[PDB]
Amino acid sequence: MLPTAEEVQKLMARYIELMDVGDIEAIVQMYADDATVEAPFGAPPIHGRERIAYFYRRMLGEGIARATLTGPVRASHNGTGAMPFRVEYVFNYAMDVRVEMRFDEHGRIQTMQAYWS
Structure with a gap:
């Protein structure tokens, strides 16, 4: 059954x-198989959990x-939710990310779209 x-x-x-x-390893495993x-x-x-790992890397x-x-x-x-959030980085940077997510019956992420500022 789809997650509530x-x-x-x-x-x-x-x-x-x-x-x-x-x-990285933990988030990659949140995502479904393909x-x-x-x-x-x-x-x-x-597409594919392999190439997603690189995106997060x-x-x-x-x-x-x-x-x-x-x-x-x-x-x-419907086992879908969106959340606006923000990421900040340390260099010798920041960005407004707004992810939508779709979960399968196994409680894993089937599709993500993310809109960057």
Whole structure:
């Protein structure tokens, strides 16, 4: 069965925590088997869990400082939710990210679109 509104926030609230600490391996396992990431939305989709790992290694790999919610987690009963948030980095940077997410019956991320500022 599809994860409830409750379970979605529990899973999506966890996303921002794994981002803030920059846990790549953990986030990659949140995603379903042949999941799609569209980040930013308008660029070619990233199919497969393998290539998603690289996207997150692009974003986090360098070393993130913070990743914090800039609005409420809008969870639906269709196993989908969106949340506007922000990421900040340490270099010798910041960006407003607004992810929408779709969960399968197994509680994993099927599709993400992310809109960057």
